[PDB]
Design a protein around this nucleic acid. Sequence first.
RNA 1: GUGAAGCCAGAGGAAACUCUGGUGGAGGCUCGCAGCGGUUCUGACGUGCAAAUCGAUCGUCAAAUCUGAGCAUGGGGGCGAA
RNA 2: UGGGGAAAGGUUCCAUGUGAACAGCGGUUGGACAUGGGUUAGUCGAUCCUAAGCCAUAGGGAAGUUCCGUUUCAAAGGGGCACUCGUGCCCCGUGUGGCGAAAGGGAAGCCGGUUAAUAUUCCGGCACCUGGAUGUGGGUUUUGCGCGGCAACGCAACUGAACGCGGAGACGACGGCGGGGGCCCCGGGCAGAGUUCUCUUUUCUUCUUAACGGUCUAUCACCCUGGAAACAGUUUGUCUGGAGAUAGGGUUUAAUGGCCGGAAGAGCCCGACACUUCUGUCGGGUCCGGUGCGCUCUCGACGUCCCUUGAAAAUCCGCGGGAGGGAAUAAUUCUCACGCCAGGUCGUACUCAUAACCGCAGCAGGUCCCCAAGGUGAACAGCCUCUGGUUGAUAGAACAAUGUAG
Lengths: 76, 48, 112, 252, 24, 91
Amino acid sequence: PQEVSDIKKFIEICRRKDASSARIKKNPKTQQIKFKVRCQRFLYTLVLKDSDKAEKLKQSLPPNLQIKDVPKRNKR
Amino acid sequence: RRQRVLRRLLVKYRASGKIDKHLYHELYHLAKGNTFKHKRALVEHIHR
Amino acid sequence: PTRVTYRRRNPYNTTSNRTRVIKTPGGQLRVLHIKKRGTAPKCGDCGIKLPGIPALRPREYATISKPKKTVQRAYGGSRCGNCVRDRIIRAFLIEEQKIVKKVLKEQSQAEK
Amino acid sequence: GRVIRNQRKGRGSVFTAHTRLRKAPAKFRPLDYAERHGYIRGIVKEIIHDPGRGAPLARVVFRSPYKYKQITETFIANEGMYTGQFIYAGKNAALTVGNILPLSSVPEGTVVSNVEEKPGDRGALGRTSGNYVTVVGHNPDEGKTRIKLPSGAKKVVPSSSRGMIGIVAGGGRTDKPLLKASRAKHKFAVKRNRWPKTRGVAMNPVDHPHGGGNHQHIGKASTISRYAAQGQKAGLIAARRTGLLRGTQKTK
Amino acid sequence: MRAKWRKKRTRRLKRKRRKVRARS
Amino acid sequence: SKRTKKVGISGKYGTRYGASLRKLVKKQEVTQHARYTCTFCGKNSVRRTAVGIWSCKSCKKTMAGGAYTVSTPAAAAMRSTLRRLREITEA
RNA sequence: GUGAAGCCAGAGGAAACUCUGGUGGAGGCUCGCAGCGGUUCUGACGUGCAAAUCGAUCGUCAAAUCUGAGCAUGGGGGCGAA
RNA sequence: UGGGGAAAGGUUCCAUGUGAACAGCGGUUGGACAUGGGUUAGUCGAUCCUAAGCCAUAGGGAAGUUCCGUUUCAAAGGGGCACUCGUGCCCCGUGUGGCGAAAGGGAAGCCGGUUAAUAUUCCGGCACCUGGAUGUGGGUUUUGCGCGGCAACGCAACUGAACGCGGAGACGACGGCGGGGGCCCCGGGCAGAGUUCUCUUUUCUUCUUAACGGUCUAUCACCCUGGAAACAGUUUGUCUGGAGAUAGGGUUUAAUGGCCGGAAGAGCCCGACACUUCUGUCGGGUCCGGUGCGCUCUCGACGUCCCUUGAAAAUCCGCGGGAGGGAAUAAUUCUCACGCCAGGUCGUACUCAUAACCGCAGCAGGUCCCCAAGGUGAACAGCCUCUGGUUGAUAGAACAAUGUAG
Ligand SMILES: [Zn+2]
Ligand SMILES: [Zn+2]
């Protein structure tokens, strides 16, 4: 796991041949939004504190790869 | 414990300016010998 | 206050079976096996530890980039730097004494 | 009877020498052209102590006259040498403490050490802590030199033998008493298996010639002849005289 | 660096050169 | 506050090994544990490491000396003889 | 538990040097658990738990202390603080 | 008398069933009898290197089975290139075998779940090391092989053959003192449980954060200005200073320290609904400080003792030197980031002992290590308790002599 500091280069990571998937996890208690992408070697994480800019980010990324929501209590 | 207490007090006095180095050094060797029983006895000797 | 056990077949305390205690997200006390501690390289002449070079086991030095393994000057490794200055001064003065010695001998004693 | 103790030591099974901690033997350089006609010099790197011996050793580094490398050596250290000292070896070397020069280029009355019995065997005589040999006189024809050995005997050696000026370091090691049984054990535990030692009178007749009896005694003369079979030489061998040494010793 | 590290690098350059020669 | 009348350093041996034998060892122990001034740097820090090795704690020089003393009377007398003999004869 | 060298402060003396209070932590020193050993009861058992064990009482315990695996010495031979 | 291992044993492990025999009484039970099942590795070991030591080769003895010999009176080796094609050239040369450690040296994996019986191996998630091939991004170059700081030195890269020098691997016992992790201890808060004739804002339990990375720091030491006697700094323990102290400002070795990812989506504690079963679903909570000659492990700076000074090799890196090679329209032998492929062989069940090893046996004997709670107390002394484990050693009735123990 490795931090991605800003928004600009995070979309650069997602536009790669080996970006298999991505997911979204939201923490209601702390008002925080996390964007995760799975590459061949690492799992880059981008942290956003605001919620308005999150909506724009979701649609800017390429439509090929899937996006999930990470529900509560994932089944075994 | 007693040696650390006496030595710590002397450093505080020198930095503030209550005593100078010539009196500080002489009191240091007096404390190494069994001269001062406790903290109260040392400050009383300084005033005199 | 739970007690722990080893996780490998070696049951003896032989300066290569080194362990430390960790607490796991499952709320249990386990044992984690660790390696030995690297030693800092020394100077060639005086014998003190060089500054600016890390201390690792001898095999790990093959995976690190060059600038992290040296210092940018003459005799970058293996010499402290105080010893390097002595070499520069000593080498210069010795050769100067050689020039005057040979001129004195060749001129003042072979004039005939 | 059985085989007595001093006969077993020749088989070399338990009574060998401990040699794990000894690094190298102490010798001079081989005789070469440079040291036969001129001189060379070397640096003293370390003064080290090796187990099982007094007389601390010294490590000296020389160059190579024919190849691009340097050779390290191991000498016996004379008293007064220090790390970083320059020492010289050869025929024309100066006469100072620590130098090595042939025994011919030496005035009478000087003390030297580690003298070669024959030129090229790299040191045989006078190499123990605080010992030396003295030159007495020369014979310029049929070159041979008279020397006096530490034991007092006199010898004649060829004039080309080598020696190192001075006295072997280590001083008066044998003055203070050992004072403890343990201290004796530590001294011998790094040399050989010869400690402790049992008196022959306390054994049984099958073990030693001194044997048993209803009282502890020898029973016969303790001076043994020079030519006797092995297993008989237990005592004072070929003794010329006996008893406390009162007067002066005529032999010299 | 050890010899095997140097042997690998020079073998790569030799292979690269032949491909250029084969092409031209 | 002297703690001893005559025993001195050899008080760790208690009442063993006999009175006479303790005196000889004290003569030799006192002189080997002391400190001597260095001949090169001048500081007062030279101590014995091995049976015949003495080294300075400041300038790191190492010198070979006697068993329990930096120098011995026999060795000192020889240097002067050698120096006097050499310089008159060849100069 | 005892408290050896080294060090600090004060007092006495013409001097040489001597007293008093602390600091420090040496020794094949000492009481004493586990380990190792085996003095007495000439105790128990003595076709026994056991072809050498059991109980109480004992010796030493930071050093000539205790111990695992690998290797060497073979019968008129080995090894032996005897 | 708990939880796991080395030597040794060899199916004793798990399930179902059972007449006789064995378990010095019984037996529906069993380590017995009968029938089936069970041990998954690039990361844990062997495999690699040498030590004490053993055995080939050159040679010498002995009628002979064989004894000695390990670098010795030996013509003893290994490195590169190109050819259609192996078969052709060119350098260096003092040296030139194997075996020998599951406790020595050593490249690399952590958490959660799962089976009647195995898992650091299986499943899910997140990582690492070696070897072999190759492409993009960035860097360097027309002054051909980088810039900055007075300095200690710094950064994402930033040519380097022969030969040579140096470091790491690499090492004793003991003593007090300081920093870090774990355990123990005290106070407050949210949940559940025990007690209640009376008292007790009471007593007890849960409140967790791995490998691997980013960023800010932490003894020693080192650098710059200046020039100290009315001598100064200073450790529990008197060492340091014109060979440059005090003071002011900087660089650097060392996280089991703080914060962020991994990571709450996990694990744990309560509550409310569902039902032959295949099956469950949904709510909340998962905090804040203090203390010490405390116990244990680890790191650092000092000190004492010696006629005692406390292993070797494989492997890995830096430097001196300057062979060869290379652009002006691209080339590149850039130790930087990302990307492609692969990792063979054998062991892995269970006991380690008042029943699984050795003593003729299910024998009061013997047999090497790791972890270590509360009270009293100087204390790993003795006595009582919590987690965990047993309730297994032929039984019933009576109380004369003589016995063993108290
Ligand atoms: Zn240096
Ligand atoms: Zn000095």
